[PDB]
Q: What sequence folds into this?
């Protein structure tokens, strides 16, 4: 990615790999290694994502928000 | 949250999202993005929570305690 | 514990909570909050433990070893 | 390992233990404590590995890449 990947990846039920980066994005990567989408947060993503039963991706950011991202990469909500 | 969210979220069986914050609280967030409860520890929560088979939430804190929190947000015990 | 708990806890099949500490020990805590055992490593335990299918607890330490601990708290092996 | 093990281990379905090290390698360790293989990345592995449904091991590295490693230790792809 654009920067160091400190976040630990989480795997969705279809095999999608989600991981944060110090370049401030949450990445969703297809199992073939091609980008599915990237979601820009405010700061570095030092949280490792967690996946909900309905596929929602949750990750903390250094901008003080907990993000909930839909599986298509659009923001579901952010909590401060 | 009040501060950076470094802790990685854990998801309960009902979808509740638990995550620590540098503002010293453990948060329980409903899947709709509304706060369920917050639990104040002594220091920053740099541990990622783990959920037991009975729903108990365990998380370490920088105050040197391992916390066990009931699913309703009340302290079950703390271990030093 | 003796020091900050940065490690994220892992839960065994019987509910035992395993977590590392900056006081250099891996703790095994019963769900009632009483100590089961503690295992001394060389340095701080900044790795979060993982539990194998046979109950073995694996954790990295800052002494450069990956530890494998039996569920009764005795060393199974260490890898450098 | 050659250096501190900060990464948290992941366990494969056959019991293989995967863990990163500050010596820049991802290790695959058999449950008997013998090395299966090691994979050299560019920098320290501060990400904890995740294992896919087909056994692929994913881990971030400080060289800015997300690595996908086959269970036999050969690179599947790297994403930047």
A:
């Amino acid at each position: 990615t654009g920067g160091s990947v400190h976040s630990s990846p989480a795997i969705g039920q279809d095999g999608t790999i989600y991981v944060g980066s110090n370049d401030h994005y949450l990445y969703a990567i297809n199992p073939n290694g091609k980008l599915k989408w990237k979601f820009e947060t405010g700061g570095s993503v030092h949280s490792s994502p967690a996946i909900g039963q309905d596929g929602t991706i949750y990750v903390g950011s250094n901008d003080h928000y907990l993000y909930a991202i839909n599986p298509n990469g659009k923001l579901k909500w952010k909590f401060e």
Summary: Chain D has one domain: 10-79. The longest strand of chain D covers residues 35-40. DSSP finds no helices and eight strands in chain D. The CA atoms of residues 47 and 60 of chain D lie 5 Å apart.
